[PDB]
Amino acid sequence: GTHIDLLFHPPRAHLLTIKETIRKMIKEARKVIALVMDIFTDVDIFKEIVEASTRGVSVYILLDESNFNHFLNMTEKQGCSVQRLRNIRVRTVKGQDYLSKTGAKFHGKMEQKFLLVDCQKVMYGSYSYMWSFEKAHLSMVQIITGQLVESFDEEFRTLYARSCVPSSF
Amino acid sequence: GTHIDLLFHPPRAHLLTIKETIRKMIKEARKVIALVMDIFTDVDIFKEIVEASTRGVSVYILLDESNFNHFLNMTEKQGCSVQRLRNIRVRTVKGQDYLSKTGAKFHGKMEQKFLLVDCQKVMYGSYSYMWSFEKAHLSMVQIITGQLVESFDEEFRTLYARSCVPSSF
Numbered sequence: 001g002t003h004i005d006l007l008f009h010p011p012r013a014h015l016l017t018i019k020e021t022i023r024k025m026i027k028e029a030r031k032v033i034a035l036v037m038d039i040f041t042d043v044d045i046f047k048e049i050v051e052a053s054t055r056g057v058s059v060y061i062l063l064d065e066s067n068f069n070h071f072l073n074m075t076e077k078q079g080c081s082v083q084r085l086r087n088i089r090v091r092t093v094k095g096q097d098y099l100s101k102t103g104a105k106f107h108g109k110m111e112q113k114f115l116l117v118d119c120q121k122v123m124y125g126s127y128s129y130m131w132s133f134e135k136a137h138l139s140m141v142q143i144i145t146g147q148l149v150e151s152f153d154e155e156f157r158t159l160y161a162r163s164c165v166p167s168s169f
Numbered sequence: 170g171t172h173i174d175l176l177f178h179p180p181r182a183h184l185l186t187i188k189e190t191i192r193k194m195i196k197e198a199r200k201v202i203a204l205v206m207d208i209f210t211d212v213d214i215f216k217e218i219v220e221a222s223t224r225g226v227s228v229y230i231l232l233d234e235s236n237f238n239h240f241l242n243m244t245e246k247q248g249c250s251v252q253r254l255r256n257i258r259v260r261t262v263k264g265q266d267y268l269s270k271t272g273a274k275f276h277g278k279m280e281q282k283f284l285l286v287d288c289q290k291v292m293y294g295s296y297s298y299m300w301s302f303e304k305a306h307l308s309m310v311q312i313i314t315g316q317l318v319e320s321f322d323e324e325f326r327t328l329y330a331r332s333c334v335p336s337s338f
């Protein structure tokens with residue numbers, strides 16, 4: 001009871017691009033959007049998310065901690081104060097703590113990305129929401145429906161519990 | 170007609186780590202191993218692949234072109250001339266060609282990571298074969314059996330057709 005389609009960028013034998021399919025999923029959302037992403041600088045996908053939030057959709061966004069200031073800078077350059085949108089909550093996730101060769105204390109990255117809409121559909125894969133994924137790289141995603149969506153829901157809730165208010169806020 | 174399980178690193182309720190499951194999948198290979206990977210520097214996984222090849226398994230490895238020298242540096246440190254193992258073929262894959270504002274022509278990366286064994290089982294996800302994914306980062310994979318495996322086989326063949334002999338070789 002799980003169904004899976006594959007999409008690629010650049011595209012193959014499918015009608016829509018990965019980015020057009022991301023916009024579609026966000027426009028179709030009626031209740032909740034849950035996003036986990038490492039780098040988020042795409043202005044067009046951000047605008048879709050904000051519009052969803054003005055419609056009354058609750059939006060929860062989990063970003064990798066090291067790269068967060070790239071997202072904040074984009075929203076500021078768009079003249080948005082993302083802090084003030086009540087229907088969106090943005091929080092950061094760190095990787096593991098570790099000691100380097102020299103004994104310094106660092107943390108790694110959250111290498112996870114997926115979009116979960118209305119607890120019924122997931123896009124999961126290697127596509128990051130930034131210009132380099134449009135113009136420079138090859139990538140792929142899965143569009144997932146059915147029972148496996150519950151597992152993504154559970155994982156989102158576990159990451160949300162770990163996540164923190166961004167230090168920049 | 171597809172079954173999918175999830176594994177995480179650091180590990181959650183499941184018995185084995187991602188790295189232990191990779192070693193397992195390789196040891197269980199009877200005919201063919203097909204691997205697509207962005208960076209490969211983990212010696213223990215490389216030892217497993219070489220041992221599979223000595224028992225007559227055919228091994229096809231596709232590596233992101235921009236990161237290839239990290240692999241080559243590892244195999245040489247280990248005292249292995251990988252280009253002399255006839256049951257292993259290593260080839261590189263480039264991202265898209267694009268032109269920067271300075272005019273110089275560059276290419277991006279292949280952002281794709283999966284292990285396909287005997288045309289029957291796939292490990293797909295965000296885990297790269299390097300020390301940072303053991304000690305520093307949070308990552309996840311899918312373990313896939315059934316009809317979806319066929320789509321991974323098609324994609325492998327498509328990337329293999331695109332791929333090139335590495336310039337060092």
Ligand SMILES: O=C(N1CCCCC1)N1CCCCC1
Nearest residue numbers: 032034060116119153156160
């Ligand atoms: O409403 C949700 N969930 C439904 C959407 C997918 C999984 C998360 N959460 C978000 C995290 C704070 C607790 C409520």
Ligand SMILES: O=C(N1CCCCC1)N1CCCCC1
Nearest residue numbers: 201203229288322325326329
């Ligand atoms: O025999 C294979 N395999 C590829 C797909 C998974 C296993 C079977 N190939 C490798 C790619 C070039 C031609 C032969």
